Amino acid sequence: GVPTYGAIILDETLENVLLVQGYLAKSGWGFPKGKVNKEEAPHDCAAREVFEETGFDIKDYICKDDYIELRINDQLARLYIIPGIPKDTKFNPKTRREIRNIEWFSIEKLPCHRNDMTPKSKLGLAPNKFFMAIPFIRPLRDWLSRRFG
Ligand SMILES: O=C(NCc1ccc(F)cc1)c1cnn2c1OCCC2
Secondary structure, three states: OOOEEEEEEEOOOOOEEEEEEOOHHHOOEEOOEEEOOOOOOHHHHHHHHHHHHHOOOOOOOOOOOOEEEEEEOOEEEEEEEEOOOOOOOOOOOOOOOOOOEEEEEEOOOOOOOOOEEHHHOEEEEOOOOOOOOHHHHHHHHHHHHHHOO
């Protein structure tokens, strides 16, 4: 799988994270990110994908060692952590053919796992519009505790 890079943008209070909503298979909410191009450095892919999806240029704010990286089904996804971005920032994707909406979400209200269906004696997980974000939420909360407290 081709690695993906993007960002976890937080506001000044550290309460809220910026999520984007795509279409079709990407219909739920997730962190802005996308596939690395041949020869492209991880930091440049993160900035490009984030700029394409949100209109916000993170290049001056990325810190090389501040990221969360997960391997999901043998694909690497690395999100650089970008705090302190004002909640009144105007975010506008480049092409609304890929991004439906861009919103701030409260970190403490976001799920960090999907719910089962043990009420129905059925296996699996209930659908959740935050499916793509969920795997990063607990590591992000733990990372913010370690880095800030
Ligand atoms: O990434 C996702 N959503 C956020 C997004 C939307 C548009 C975009 F351009 C970038 C990020 C997403 C949701 N569901 N799936 C996703 O991607 C993997 C397959 C299933």
